[PDB]
Design a protein around this ligand. Structure first.
Ligand SMILES: C[C@H]1Oc2cc(cnc2N)-c2c(C3CC3)nn(C)c2CN(C)C(=O)c2ccc(F)cc21
Length: 288
């Protein structure tokens, strides 16, 4: 199978095959994902040896997708190991892990009262919006911009957030498998996807970030979300969320895709929130 990006067509022959003998698995991280070494530290995405032909093409497509991107806020691909079984996709090891687990585990707590501040959250949001802007200007529609699909370079203050998973854009599973909680009305009703699909999803990711890793639409099922969103329903601000941050979310959630901001506008608004002392001086809630 072939793949086209930035006006250039590529094939499996363009993937950087890393000799299997050079790869060593260290631990399971959560097909399985392992921490590995090539010394270069890597996250090893594996293809189960017992899989369908569609699973193989999906895996090969994902390798092509990630290898052709070149941006600071998109996970790097070191190479692949497709000439040995199980097949491997070699990614940049992101020591901070996924954004969802990070937010949940690093929540300000009585023991860690200042573990995260509004500025840490704004920096993550900017980093992903910068990755989204690169995808938008390269006419790539992600389809699942969500905390679970983002990674961090380290747990510390100099962390860099990156988009780490491209399984959804690759697929294009059933109804209860569509990430309807991250989807705008024209995507779940008409199956229409544009650059404005990622804007809506980004607003939901912003809610995930500022809620510190909660599941969107608390207590609502997929069908309830579908009906809620269709009827003009929107999420409330996460706890202690400054008004200017929530305003970015509600602009991302405009019913008409044309009324939703592009990522250059999102980045300008995130930048303004970081400069605003009334935003960054707001204390995050302390979980008991
Ligand atoms: C495929 C996988 O990639 C990585 C996974 C990790 C780090 N870095 C890369 N590149 C990683 C680590 C290591 C620091 C220990 N801990 N956790 C919790 C994860 C996440 N995870 C198990 C994944 O399956 C995952 C999730 C989202 C994603 F977007 C890509 C990946």
């Amino acid at each position: 199978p072939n793949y086209c990006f930035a006006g250039k067509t590529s094939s499996i022959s363009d993937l950087k095959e890393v000799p299997r003998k050079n790869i060593t698995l260290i631990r399971g991280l959560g097909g399985e994902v392992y921490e590995g070494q090539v010394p270069l530290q890597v996250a090893v995405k594996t293809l189960p040896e017992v899989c369908s032909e569609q699973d193989e093409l999906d895996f090969l497509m994902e390798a092509l997708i990630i290898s052709k991107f070149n941006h600071q806020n998109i996970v790097r691909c070191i190479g692949v190991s497709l000439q040995s079984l199980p097949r491997f996709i070699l990614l940049e090891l992101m020591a901070g892990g996924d954004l969802k687990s990070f937010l949940r585990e690093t929540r300000p707590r009585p023991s860690q009262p200042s573990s995260l501040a509004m500025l840490d959250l704004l920096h993550v949001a900017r980093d992903i919006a910068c990755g989204c802007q690169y995808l938008e200007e390269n006419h790539f529609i992600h389809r699942d911009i969500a905390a679970r699909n983002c990674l961090l370079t380290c747990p510390g203050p100099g962390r860099v957030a990156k988009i780490g998973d491209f399984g959804m854009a690759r697929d294009i599973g059933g109804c209860a498998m569509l990430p309807v909680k991250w989807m705008p009305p024209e995507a779940f009703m008409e199956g229409i996807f544009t650059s404005k699909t990622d804007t809506w999803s980004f607003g939901v990711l912003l809610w995930e970030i500022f809620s510190l890793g909660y599941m969107p639409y608390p207590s609502k099922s997929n069908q309830e979300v579908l009906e809620f969103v269709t009827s003009g329903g929107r999420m409330d601000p996460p706890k202690n969320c400054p008004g200017p941050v929530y305003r970015i979310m509600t602009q991302c959630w405009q019913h008409q895709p044309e009324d939703r901001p592009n990522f250059a506008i999102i980045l300008e608004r995130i930048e303004y929130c970081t400069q605003d002392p009334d935003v960054i001086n707001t204390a995050l809630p302390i979980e008991y």
